[PDB]
Amino acid sequence: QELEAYGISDVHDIVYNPSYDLLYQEELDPSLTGYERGVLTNLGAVAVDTGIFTGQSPKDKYIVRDDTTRDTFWWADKGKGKNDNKPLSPETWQHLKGLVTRQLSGKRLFVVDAFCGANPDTRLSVRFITEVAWQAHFVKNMFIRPSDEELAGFKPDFIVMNGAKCTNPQWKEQGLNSENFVAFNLTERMQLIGGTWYGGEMKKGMFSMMNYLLPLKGIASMHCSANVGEKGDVAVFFGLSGTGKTTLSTDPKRRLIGDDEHGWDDDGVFNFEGGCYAKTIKLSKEAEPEIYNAIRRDALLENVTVREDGTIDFDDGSKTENTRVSYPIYHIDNIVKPVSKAGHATKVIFLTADAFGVLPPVSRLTADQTQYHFLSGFTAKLAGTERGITEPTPTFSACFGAAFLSLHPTQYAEVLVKRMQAAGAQAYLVNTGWNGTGKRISIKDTRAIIDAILNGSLDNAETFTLPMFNLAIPTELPGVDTKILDPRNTYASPEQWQEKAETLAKLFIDNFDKYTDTPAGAALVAAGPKL
């Protein structure tokens, strides 16, 4: 009846609000075939393969262009910086909606109702529809699980229909990138998924919608982790994928607010999600004990290698480097509860994994440097590794998450700065990546830096200015190996560091030029690196 209103017909079996026990038994059903199948690991958690897609597909992301979105969305084709917000006609949207609704017609469907956003005043009431048990599990893990009371009066104001099993044969004619699609309609308030089974598309899809609606009513919407000390002091950690937001916010000395998506309104910082989505490549029990410990029944492992005897080879990246596990946030012992939110952040930390080996492990940023490095959104990676090559490859992703921005970067920078100023927050840049050794800084050294930021040690330290990037760096910090604080010390000579710094400075300078078409942007150039 109600499923019909969405266009899904002849649904025989409806599993509304599936329990964790039911999801466990659905995933291990021995008659499942293909990518629906789960296998039980010795840690008690079920592991699945997500299919050919093992990460987001930005090239398949489309947003319907209509009178509601025309003048507010950050469109990929309106010459305002590179992004993945590709415009979609309403007519083609109706075609994709027919593909997905027909695929889900005549099937057994899982329907998960959940919240995106910790606060009733700004949260989305999302209804997720799928025919794959582990997809419903993923959304039960990653979104906010309502109370029985909230379920009774649940009134969806966004529908996500996951049609991973269907594809679009009309895509060439329609000007699309492939037979797969991840599409959003703000008029009908719906997300459609076709071709990719990857659960991340639903998580980041609703993130992108929050990123669109929250700043339009004065609320920051942020790609960050967040935690809070006993005294109520809040830290947020920005950064691109793989830079350490989840690894480093899971800190037994802090209460976890969230690991990936947060808003910032008049009362403080608040988590969007009900779970965490940790990377498991090379996962070390000794280095990341709380994340490791979260891997138990009700956690959902993705694309890991599971041996015949049920043990996991966390080292094996053969399916993908992006091996993951999701778990409800209460699989972490020390968290904020029952509501994932706290006060205003006073520490704002930009994580970056600098494969060029130039940036210092830690530096406290000026106000202009904060805006400069927020708009720049830099990280890099050794792309040549499988070829035995050191191909440092830069990524500049505005606000440390341009793939999920629905508005222009400046709109996120503006509201972040307003929130920071009102709170007297301070910002820091942390290289969680490489130095002159050609190896990453150890997790142990990085946690000690984060400690030094949070407890005021770094603020009381004697500092000097790193040349070129003009970053204030400490001579020493409690519990941190002193040699690494100056990035020049791990090369044969400061001159060898300088050669790489000049290379990276020019990358930053070229990237930043697109923000200088305003007076404020051009004024920020002086805060960036100077040859």
Ligand SMILES: Nc1ncnc2c1ncn2[C@@H]1O[C@H](COP(=O)(O)OP(=O)(O)OP(=O)(O)O)[C@@H](O)[C@H]1O
């Ligand atoms: N010094 C370090 N600091 C943080 N992480 C490190 C360090 N050295 C290695 N790592 C590894 O880098 C990865 C950090 O990934 P993490 O899951 O924290 O990324 P993220 O910022 O949460 O990304 P996403 O937004 O995609 O979820 C982990 O695999 C971690 O084990």
Ligand SMILES: [Mn+2]
């Ligand atoms: Mn993460």
Ligand SMILES: [Mn+2]
């Ligand atoms: Mn993320």
